[PDB]
Design an enzyme around this catalytic site. Structure first.
Site, PDB file in Angstrom:
ATOM      1  N   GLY A  24       0.811  -1.200   0.000  1.00 34.71           N
ATOM      2  CA  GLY A  24       0.000   0.000   0.000  1.00 34.71           C
ATOM      3  C   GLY A  24       0.848   1.254   0.000  1.00 34.71           C
ATOM      4  O   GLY A  24       2.048   1.214  -0.282  1.00 34.71           O
ATOM      5  N   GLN A  25       0.213   2.370   0.332  1.00 37.15           N
ATOM      6  CA  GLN A  25       0.857   3.674   0.310  1.00 37.15           C
ATOM      7  C   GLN A  25       1.966   3.787   1.355  1.00 37.15           C
ATOM      8  O   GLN A  25       2.996   4.420   1.116  1.00 37.15           O
ATOM      9  CB  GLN A  25      -0.195   4.756   0.547  1.00 37.15           C
ATOM     10  CG  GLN A  25       0.284   6.170   0.345  1.00 37.15           C
ATOM     11  CD  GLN A  25      -0.843   7.166   0.474  1.00 37.15           C
ATOM     12  OE1 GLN A  25      -1.987   6.796   0.747  1.00 37.15           O
ATOM     13  NE2 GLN A  25      -0.531   8.441   0.274  1.00 37.15           N
ATOM     14  N   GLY A  27       3.619   1.214   2.938  1.00 33.97           N
ATOM     15  CA  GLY A  27       4.570   0.111   2.995  1.00 33.97           C
ATOM     16  C   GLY A  27       3.989  -1.236   2.615  1.00 33.97           C
ATOM     17  O   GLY A  27       2.926  -1.317   1.995  1.00 33.97           O
ATOM     18  N   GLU A  28       4.685  -2.299   3.001  1.00 31.84           N
ATOM     19  CA  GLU A  28       4.297  -3.646   2.601  1.00 31.84           C
ATOM     20  C   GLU A  28       4.034  -4.567   3.789  1.00 31.84           C
ATOM     21  O   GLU A  28       4.388  -4.249   4.926  1.00 31.84           O
ATOM     22  CB  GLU A  28       5.360  -4.253   1.681  1.00 31.84           C
ATOM     23  CG  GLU A  28       5.502  -3.537   0.343  1.00 31.84           C
ATOM     24  CD  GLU A  28       6.753  -3.948  -0.406  1.00 31.84           C
ATOM     25  OE1 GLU A  28       7.738  -4.342   0.255  1.00 31.84           O
ATOM     26  OE2 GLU A  28       6.758  -3.867  -1.653  1.00 31.84           O
ATOM     27  N   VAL A  29       3.402  -5.704   3.511  1.00 29.64           N
ATOM     28  CA  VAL A  29       3.179  -6.738   4.518  1.00 29.64           C
ATOM     29  C   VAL A  29       3.642  -8.088   3.986  1.00 29.64           C
ATOM     30  O   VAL A  29       3.139  -8.568   2.971  1.00 29.64           O
ATOM     31  CB  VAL A  29       1.702  -6.833   4.920  1.00 29.64           C
ATOM     32  CG1 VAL A  29       1.505  -7.937   5.954  1.00 29.64           C
ATOM     33  CG2 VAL A  29       1.219  -5.496   5.455  1.00 29.64           C
ATOM     34  N   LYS A  43       5.613  -6.244   8.737  1.00 30.73           N
ATOM     35  CA  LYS A  43       5.075  -5.003   8.195  1.00 30.73           C
ATOM     36  C   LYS A  43       6.223  -4.013   8.055  1.00 30.73           C
ATOM     37  O   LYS A  43       6.892  -3.687   9.034  1.00 30.73           O
ATOM     38  CB  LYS A  43       4.016  -4.442   9.142  1.00 30.73           C
ATOM     39  CG  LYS A  43       3.288  -3.206   8.646  1.00 30.73           C
ATOM     40  CD  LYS A  43       2.406  -2.647   9.753  1.00 30.73           C
ATOM     41  CE  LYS A  43       1.610  -1.437   9.294  1.00 30.73           C
ATOM     42  NZ  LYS A  43       0.776  -0.887  10.400  1.00 30.73           N
ATOM     43  N   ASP A 134     -11.249   0.845  15.182  1.00 33.27           N
ATOM     44  CA  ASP A 134     -11.189   0.288  13.830  1.00 33.27           C
ATOM     45  C   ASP A 134     -11.659  -1.166  13.851  1.00 33.27           C
ATOM     46  O   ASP A 134     -11.117  -2.009  13.134  1.00 33.27           O
ATOM     47  CB  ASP A 134      -9.747   0.356  13.313  1.00 33.27           C
ATOM     48  CG  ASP A 134      -9.658   0.397  11.796  1.00 33.27           C
ATOM     49  OD1 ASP A 134     -10.696   0.557  11.125  1.00 33.27           O
ATOM     50  OD2 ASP A 134      -8.526   0.289  11.278  1.00 33.27           O
TER      51      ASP A 134
HETATM   52  C1  LIG Z   1      -0.126  -7.227  10.159  1.00 32.78           C
HETATM   53  C2  LIG Z   1      -1.360  -6.870   9.355  1.00 32.78           C
HETATM   54  C3  LIG Z   1      -1.706  -7.986   8.394  1.00 32.78           C
HETATM   55  C4  LIG Z   1      -2.282  -7.698   7.153  1.00 32.78           C
HETATM   56  C5  LIG Z   1      -2.609  -8.721   6.260  1.00 32.78           C
HETATM   57  N1  LIG Z   1      -3.180  -8.401   5.015  1.00 32.78           N
HETATM   58  C6  LIG Z   1      -2.785  -7.209   4.270  1.00 32.78           C
HETATM   59  C7  LIG Z   1      -3.377  -7.419   2.882  1.00 32.78           C
HETATM   60  C8  LIG Z   1      -4.195  -8.700   2.915  1.00 32.78           C
HETATM   61  C9  LIG Z   1      -4.199  -9.211   4.352  1.00 32.78           C
HETATM   62  C10 LIG Z   1      -5.520  -8.840   5.021  1.00 32.78           C
HETATM   63  O1  LIG Z   1      -6.481  -8.445   4.032  1.00 32.78           O
HETATM   64  N2  LIG Z   1      -2.352  -9.987   6.626  1.00 32.78           N
HETATM   65  N3  LIG Z   1      -2.624 -11.134   5.832  1.00 32.78           N
HETATM   66  C11 LIG Z   1      -2.204 -12.169   6.609  1.00 32.78           C
HETATM   67  N4  LIG Z   1      -2.262 -13.476   6.258  1.00 32.78           N
HETATM   68  C12 LIG Z   1      -2.720 -13.873   5.048  1.00 32.78           C
HETATM   69  C13 LIG Z   1      -2.871 -12.955   4.010  1.00 32.78           C
HETATM   70  C14 LIG Z   1      -3.342 -13.371   2.767  1.00 32.78           C
HETATM   71  O2  LIG Z   1      -3.489 -12.466   1.745  1.00 32.78           O
HETATM   72  C15 LIG Z   1      -2.830 -12.674   0.494  1.00 32.78           C
HETATM   73  C16 LIG Z   1      -3.667 -14.708   2.560  1.00 32.78           C
HETATM   74  C17 LIG Z   1      -3.518 -15.630   3.592  1.00 32.78           C
HETATM   75  O3  LIG Z   1      -3.841 -16.947   3.379  1.00 32.78           O
HETATM   76  C18 LIG Z   1      -3.201 -17.685   2.338  1.00 32.78           C
HETATM   77  C19 LIG Z   1      -3.044 -15.212   4.835  1.00 32.78           C
HETATM   78  C20 LIG Z   1      -1.661 -11.680   7.897  1.00 32.78           C
HETATM   79  C21 LIG Z   1      -1.083 -12.369   9.086  1.00 32.78           C
HETATM   80  N5  LIG Z   1      -0.772 -11.643  10.157  1.00 32.78           N
HETATM   81  O4  LIG Z   1      -0.908 -13.573   9.055  1.00 32.78           O
HETATM   82  C22 LIG Z   1      -1.800 -10.213   7.825  1.00 32.78           C
HETATM   83  N6  LIG Z   1      -1.464  -9.270   8.731  1.00 32.78           N
END
Ligand SMILES: CCc1cc(N2CCC[C@@H]2CO)n2nc(Nc3cc(OC)cc(OC)c3)c(C(N)=O)c2n1
Length: 271
Positions: A24-25, A27-29, A43, A134
């Site tokens: 996103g704007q 940074g990355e995750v 993050k 939120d």
């Molecule tokens: C620390 C904040 C944050 C944001 C985030 N995000 C950011 C973008 C998408 C996801 C939440 O919508 N995700 N997505 C995660 N896991 C995840 C994401 C996926 O998306 C591709 C697909 C998955 O299953 C295969 C697991 C995790 C996490 N803490 O494990 C997470 N944490």
């Protein structure tokens, strides 16, 4: 504590970013590994996109909010690029997971179960004199065992004096945010209760957007008339009447998170 004393500080060398989950704007995750074996979520902050202090404010707050039902701070890297490293949730966002094949087959029982876990988490936040601001399915994370944990504490605040007040230009998602926070910028744990109400409709409709087919202004207009969200499809009347308690006009009339938890647990063991 300075970084050379902060127990949450790790050398960047301990981290290997493997798969980018989001960009996103600001940074990355990433999915990563700490010291080779431990799966974590990283993050990262995009330099210049926003203040490092503002970025790091979230981790500092998480150092104060530790509980099984809240995503855990794993570590920080306080030199650019700044990393925040947190507990990794295998099933990701609740709003997303409910929409997968696995999510779709979940019984109303299991849904009420997850709803009780979210409330149990918010109940801990409640006792600690914090708020979240939120609270929504997008910000609830699911584990590989189908458990739920609160996440994203960017807006979370500590309430010494029983109320936190934002600024003038501060804007928030209208569908999820209580009237008093939208209108006056005043937030309390009771504001979260209202959001939890919306979040419940997300759970039972497998992640559908609240107030189906209404624009924000239609939602505000309806609420002021005394109307609340129309009964979602396939919604237990018990749950809907629970959502309604959350949507009471006066903040102080809305139930505690501890009450909400215990009620959702009776609902769950009953089915
Ligand atoms: C620390 C904040 C944050 C944001 C985030 N995000 C950011 C973008 C998408 C996801 C939440 O919508 N995700 N997505 C995660 N896991 C995840 C994401 C996926 O998306 C591709 C697909 C998955 O299953 C295969 C697991 C995790 C996490 N803490 O494990 C997470 N944490």
């Amino acid at each position: 504590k300075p970084w050379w004393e902060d127990e949450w500080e790790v050398p960047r060398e301990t981290l290997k970013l493997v798969e980018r989950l989001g960009a996103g704007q600001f940074g990355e995750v990433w999915m990563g590994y700490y010291n080779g074996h431990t799966k974590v979520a990283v993050k990262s902050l995009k330099q210049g996109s926003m203040s490092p202090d503002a970025f790091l404010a979230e981790a500092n707050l998480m150092k104060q909010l530790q509980h099984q039902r809240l995503v855990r701070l794993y570590a920080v890297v306080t030199q650019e690029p700044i990393y925040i490293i947190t507990e990794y949730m295998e099933n990701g966002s609740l709003v997303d997971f409910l929409k997968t094949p696995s999510g779709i087959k979940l019984t109303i029982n299991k849904l009420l179960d997850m709803a009780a876990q979210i409330a149990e988490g918010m109940a801990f936040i409640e006792e600690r004199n914090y708020i979240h601001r939120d609270l929504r399915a997008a910000n609830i994370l699911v584990s590989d065992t189908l458990s739920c944990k609160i996440a994203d504490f960017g807006l979370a605040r500590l309430i010494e004096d029983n109320e936190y007040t934002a600024r003038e230009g501060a804007k928030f998602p209208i569908k999820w945010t209580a009237p008093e926070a939208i209108n006056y910028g005043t937030f309390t744990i009771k504001s979260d209760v209202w959001s939890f109400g919306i979040l419940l409709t997300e759970i039972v409709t497998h992640g559908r957007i609240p107030y189906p087919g209404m624009t924000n202004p239609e939602v505000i207009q309806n609420l002021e008339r005394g109307y609340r969200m129309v009964r979602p499809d396939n919604c237990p009347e018990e749950l809907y009447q629970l959502m309604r308690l959350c949507w009471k006009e006066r903040p102080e009339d809305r139930p505690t998170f501890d009450y909400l938890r215990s009620v959702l647990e009776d609902f769950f063991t009953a089915t």
